[PDB]
Every structure is written in C-alpha cells, then in structure tokens.
C-alpha cells in the first residue's frame, strides 16, 4: 500500500505493549556459550521473537518452506521468515510497576508538572527514599 | 526553498566579512560591531567627549530626543558628505559604520 497520510504518537500503555508482543521473556539468558544457540524463554528467543535461520524451528523438527502459520508442539517456535527477528517486538512483565525516566527526569518533569511537586522530592518517591 | 537554500549555500566556498557575515546575518545573531539605528527621526547634534561620541537626535514630531554615550571612537560615522553637527537623519538609516542589529531594525521599522 505504502500510503499513510498522517502519523500520530502518544505513550505506550502496558495493554498496547502486551498487544504488540508475541511472547514473554522470563529467564536472564542470551545464547549458550557451548553450541551458540538462542536460549528458551530468554533474550534472542525464537519462540517469542523469531527463527534464527530462514524457515527453521529451534529443536529442528519443522525446517520446510511448504507449511506456514503453525506452532511446533515441542519448542513452540513459529516457522516463518528470519526478517521477523527485526520486527516482532517483545515485552518484560515487571513484578512491581516502574515509571518512565523521560516523564520524570525531563526538565521540566512532565509527571512533576502534572502532579505538581519538586523534582528532588519526586526523585525520593520513585527511588524509595519517602 | 531547497533550490534557494543550495543556491545561497554553494558559493560560500568562493568568498574570503565574508561567510562569517553571511552565517551571522542568516543565524540572525547580534553583530560583532553593534552599530545602533535612529529610534526617532530628527536632526543630529554630536558632542565630542574625552575620546567618546555623545550623539543627540532632536526630534521633528515632538517627543524625547534619542541620546547615546559609550560607543568606541573607531566605529566611525556613516557617510551621508560625512555625518557632523547640522544635519537631519531618518528613522530608517544606520548611525555608524559596521552592521545594524536586525532585532533593532525589526522592532522600529516593522
């Protein structure tokens, strides 16, 4: 199509950030030092992000181009193009809610001008000193 | 816009005052030689102090005369023969040789 007249912005709500995301990363691991493969439910994870090689699952059961739009029961990776690894956004569920630094440490503070308080006091609230 | 931009931008290489004056005028900053303009139209009278120029402009309309005190002796008066006591100066024209502050010209002459 390549036809969008205007471009609107805003603030990413947890709902919209969840709606964006395809899977939830829930382990602090990138790639295995031995084999150099992506780690399951970690960063670079094929299940949540996308497949390493073009039309190839993690475990290595479905590696054919013929089929598309199916999730492998063993690993849970979807067999599509690799380019999605530079598209399919992820997310992290914070056990405790965390504010954005841009609406806080900005000069003047947007949260600070919204809720009407000193930035030095707002610092103490966010950084658990009050 | 871009035609004009590039047209103005290109022959900066073929200059030597020069590109400083161009970028100073385009960036709309206060000049290196702050030569004031006439705030009101009237007749000029210049008193020569201890190595200083006291210019007073007596107005034609009927208000307060424009007075200046502390400007350097090596700024030089505008050639309009040359500016001395017993002359009538316009609100538009520059007073001394150098560069007229744009902000000053805008607020006075629109």
């Amino acid at each position: 199509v390549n036809f969008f007249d205007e471009l609107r912005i805003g603030l990413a709500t947890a709902d919209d950030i969840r709606n964006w995301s395809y899977g939830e990363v829930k382990k602090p691991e990138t790639i295995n030092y031995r084999t150099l493969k992506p780690e399951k439910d970690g960063l670079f994870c094929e299940k949540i992000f996308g497949p390493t090689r073009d039309w190839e699952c993690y475990c290595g059961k479905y590696k054919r181009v013929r089929f598309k739009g199916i999730i492998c029961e063993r690993c849970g990776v979807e067999v599509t193009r690799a380019k999605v690894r530079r598209e399919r956004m992820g997310h992290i569920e914070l056990a405790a809610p965390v504010t954005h630094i841009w609406y806080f440490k900005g000069v003047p503070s947007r949260l600070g001008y919204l809720l009407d308080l000193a930035p030095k006091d707002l610092e103490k609230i966010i950084y658990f000193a009050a | 816009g871009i035609v004009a931009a590039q047209s103005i931008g290109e022959p900066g290489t073929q200059l030597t005052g020069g590109l400083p004056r161009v970028q100073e005028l385009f960036e709309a900053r206060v000049p290196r030689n702050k030569a004031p303009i006439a705030d009101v139209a009237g007749r000029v009278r210049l008193e020569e102090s201890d190595k200083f120029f006291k210019i007073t402009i007596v107005p034609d309309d009927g208000g307060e005369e424009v007075v200046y005190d502390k400007l350097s002796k090596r700024q030089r008066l505008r050639v309009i023969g040359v500016l001395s006591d017993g002359d009538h100066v316009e609100v538009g024209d520059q007073l001394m040789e150098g560069a007229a502050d744009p902000h000053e010209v805008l607020r006075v002459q629109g």
Partner: protein, 530 residues
Amino acid sequence: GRFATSDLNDLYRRVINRNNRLKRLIDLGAPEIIVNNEKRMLQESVDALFDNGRRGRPVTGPGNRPLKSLSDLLKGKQGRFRQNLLGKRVDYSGRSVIVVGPQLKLHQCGLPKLMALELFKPFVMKRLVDLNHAQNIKSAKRMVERQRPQVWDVLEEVIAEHPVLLNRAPTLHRLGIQAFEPQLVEGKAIQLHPLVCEAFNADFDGDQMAVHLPLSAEAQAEARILMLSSNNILSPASGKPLAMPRLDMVTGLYYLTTLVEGATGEYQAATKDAPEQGVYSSPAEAIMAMDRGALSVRAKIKVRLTELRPPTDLEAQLFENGWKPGDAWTAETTLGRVMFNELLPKSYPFVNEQMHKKVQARIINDLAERFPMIVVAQTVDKLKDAGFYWATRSGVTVSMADVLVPPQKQEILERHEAEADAIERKYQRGALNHTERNESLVKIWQDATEEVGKALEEFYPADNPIITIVKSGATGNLTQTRTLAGMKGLVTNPKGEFIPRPIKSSFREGLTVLEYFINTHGARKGLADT
C-alpha cells in the same frame, strides 16, 4: 570466536535478572526493605535501560565505558534520526575517476565499459534473454559475469537513452547532480563533459564522481526531463548559463574571433592598380583560402554570407522586407567570426566581435532568453568543439621567453626604495614611530605593486599567451600575471598584518629563500582558510 556484543543486551539482562529476583522475592514472601531495595534496583535498571548516564552515574561493563542505552540509538551525531536515515549506501550505483570527453555532446557522458557492464548487468541480462544469446537467465548472468564478446553488441542496445545520475561530492548545489546518456568507453575512467565541470565544481585533479542508475520509469523520466544536463544550462542562482565555455574553449574562441591588423589575406582596398583582395564569395572559399597557405583566420576580410543573419543595423539597411534562408549580403569580419556565427543558430543575428567570456555569457544569455534550451545546449556544444579545436591552433603556450619582465621594473622599484630608505633616514633622527613607518612602507610598496601591475600591460603584447589566458577571461587574473611576472608585492603574516619588506622579485626571477619563507605564511594561511 570472540563476541562484539551490543550494550542493550547487558541492560535487558540486568532488568530481567532483577525482575526474576523481585518475582522470586514476591514468591518467597520477603520483608518490605529487600523488596523496596530490589524495586529501587529494578527502577534504576529500567531508568538506565531507557536513558544511561542521565540519573547520577552511567552503567559500564568492560573497561569503564558507558553502556549504549535505547535512547542512545536515537540521540547524537551517530543517532538513528541523523546518521542512519539522512545518508545511506545505494545499489545500481558506481564511483570512478573523471576524465574530459570533448568528443561527447553535452547530454552524453562516457562510462568505463568494465563499470557499465556490471552497472547495467540485469538490464543487459534481460535483453540477452530477450535475444537468443543466452538460453536461460543463469547463462546470461554467467555470460555477462565472464565478459564474453556478445555482451558489447547488446550493452549499447540496452544503454540506448537509459540515463545515469552523475554526482561529485561535496554535492553543494542542485546541478551538483546531473543526468547523462552513458556512451560506452574503453578504460576505467568516467569521460565527463567539459562544460558540466563548473556545474559539479569538479577539476580532473583526481576528483572522483558517483554514477547512479535510475531504475523506475518515473526516475528515468525525472532524470531525462528535470536534471538532464542539456535541459538545465541556466544555474538556479542568477538564471545565468552555468554550462558555458570556460578555460581552454574561452581562449580558443577568443583567438578564433579576435581581429588582427597586418595579417594574411587581409582587406586592403587597393587604389588604381589592384582590386580590394581581402574579399571572398563564400565562407567555403575563405576556408579553402585558409587551409591552403593564403588566408589568416584573424584577418578583417569582406565575406559574402547566405546562411547567417546580419547585425540589427545591417538587417534594416539591406533587406527590410524578405529574409535570408538563401539570399546574400556582404560582411567586413574575420573568417573566425563567420566560423563562430556558423556555430550559433540560423535565425540568431551576427556578432562581429572578439568572444570574451562576458560576451559569450551575454550571447548564451540572449540565446537562453530568446531561443529554446536545446538550441542553447547544442550551440554551446558547437562553441565547445570549435573552441577546443581553435584552442590548439591558438598558440597559447608558456616559456621563460613568453613570460616577460617590464623594462622599467628596475627604475620604478628602486625609486620606491629612495622614498622608503629616506623614511629610515627620518626614523634614525627620531620623528616618525615604527607603526606609522610600517604602514607608510605598506602604502609605498602597494603603490609600487600598482605601478608594476599597470606598467606590465603597457609593455606585454596582446597575442602573448599569458595576456590571452587572462584578457580572454578564460581563467587567471591580472594579480596572478603580476605575481608571476614583475613581483608578488606585499604578502600577509598569519595574523592578517602585512610584512613591511615586500617580495621585490618576480616568480620568473625566483624569490630569495627569505622572500619565499615570508610568502609561505599567506599561502599556508590561505590553504588553512580554504
């Protein structure tokens, strides 16, 4: 084996770690202090992730360097917005060194065949599969990859009116990019047109250019109509013709058109005995009289012209009813001016003048405002070809004999010593100070420079190549001629102040080590400024 990992990974790791630990502390049922501390750590981790080195100290990994945040992708000169969006690498594009291509028409440019072949590889492959040269695409790809003899018959059939955008960095002005018809050339250089060199500000002193192949029909069109060099002769500055003759062409046409007394085949107008002699039935006759040793191109001859339109005053006095598609009228001109007007368009009137770069400027301006752009494009190309042809047989060549010195340079200089030394005789007594002396010296030696600057032109003959080059307006100034022959005069210090002892010697004579060493300042200063 070694990893060149991005910093984001470490921040995301730090966040997910502290998130997992916090979730484990929530699962455990821990006290408030450790949970609030872990929440502070998490808060600081996400804060650092979104903006590193904003609140207090930045996060660092190997060797005390701050981690590239998510916002650090966007901010800076190496930002996404700035670096990785405004200037990119491009496919279907080449770069090479430019050479002159004076055989080429303005709209044409010469492309190195070994470049061209690769630059149009798919386009030539398409036509190679269209023809029964290649059986399938892969064999065409292989054929063009191998550079087989059959490709060359096709590559012109493929390149036929498929223009290319030539660029010369830095791309200052709009014409700094121009579209051209790529003519194949054997070599590894881009044969640029001589006129467009000013439109690129491109010398042939190693300066590279970048070819781009516009692929889309729309692009091909845009190239052809908007920015094809022929279509935009006039600069987008003063609306003056930028693609006009400069350097050689100028001296070529200057020599071609300029008039000379006491020449070969000259107009005499003899009394009693002989006829007028310097009178010729046709420009053809005059050309035959020139090529055979009998007529000199720069002779005030009386030629009878048919194809050319006369001067505005001579239009009225002769015809003033019918036109001259094939009539006849007499002109007291130079063969060269007729060979010049032969280049200028049919319905354009006669000039009968020496073709100074300004005269060329106003002529090509008149052509630009009066005639279509194609007429200008072509006429200025004929002016280029003719100009260059006549640049050779101009006889513009430099020699130690050709570069002269003014014979009064001894008299006028030494006199200007007698005024200077005198000041010293005034100083030693104690009247004038060093600073006023230092200025009066500058005045005196500037006057001395001026005297030589004038005196040079009074002595130097007209045909003198040095005088040709400058007084044509081709290139160079009377300043450069004065600092080449006579003396450089006063040269400036690196502060801006002038040195009171000048260069009292021509570059022809050669400077003394000191006079040179003083000259170095202003030149290095100039190089540092440019």
